[PDB]
Each structure stands twice: as C-alpha cells, then as structure tokens.
C-alpha cells in the first residue's frame with residue numbers, strides 16, 4: 160500500500176548512512192551471548208531489530224503501517240527495558256526513535 164511504501168522509506172532512512180552513528184546497535188539482532196548478556200532473553204520476550212523488520216517488509220509480512228510501527232517501537236522498548244537509562248545505547252535509541260516518530264507522523 161501507499162502507507163507501507165512510506166514505512167519502507169522510513170526503514171531505508173533508519174538504515175542509511177546519515178543516521179549510522181546512532182542506528183548501528185539496531186542493525187542486527189542482539190547477540191546476547193556474544194555480549195555476555197546472559198539475562199537478555201529472560202527479560203526480552205520478543206526481540207526485534209532493523210534487519211528483521213527489513214526481512215518482514217521484503218516478504219510482505221506486514222498487513223499495514225500500524226503493524227510495522229508496532230515492531231519498530233518494540234525494538235526501542237526492548238532497549239529501554241533491558242538497559243539502564245543512562246546507557247549510551249538508550250541515548251542512541253531515543254535519537255533513532257525521534258527520527259522514526261517524526262517521519263511516521265508524516266504518513267499519507
């Protein structure tokens with residue numbers, strides 16, 4: 160749909176070089192074992208990341224823009240849930256979510 164094209168545009172922007180300084184932690188699933196975060200999957204029931212959103216978009220998994228937005232917001236919420244509020248990754252999440260929310264609000 161036209162709204163899903165707008166969502167795909169947002170996704171492309173979130174993955175683009177101009178946001179890479181703060182978007183990079185969200186590019187791929189959290190590899191909890193690689194990071195020593197042995198409680199991550201006890202705390203985060205539904206992991207999400209931009210590569211998974213992209214795969215879902217490419218596979219036409221999303222019914223509508225609302226479903227896409229719920230996944231992007233789940234990704235940020237997982238970050239806010241797991242990490243202390245003063246962690247660098249939380250500051251990066253807030254900045255990337257600001258990009259997302261302002262452009263999602265421009266949906267046709």
Ligand SMILES: Cc1nnc2n1-c1ccc(-c3cnn(C)c3)cc1[C@H](Nc1ccc(Cl)cc1)CC2
Pocket residue numbers: 183184185188189190194196237238241242247248
């Ligand atoms: C998102 C998110 N939500 N919870 C976490 N993550 C996260 C995802 C990926 C990476 C990572 C590390 N390497 N690669 C290639 C990816 C690091 C983190 C966080 N760690 C972190 C993040 C940013 C900075 Cl500046 C310092 C530490 C802790 C776990």
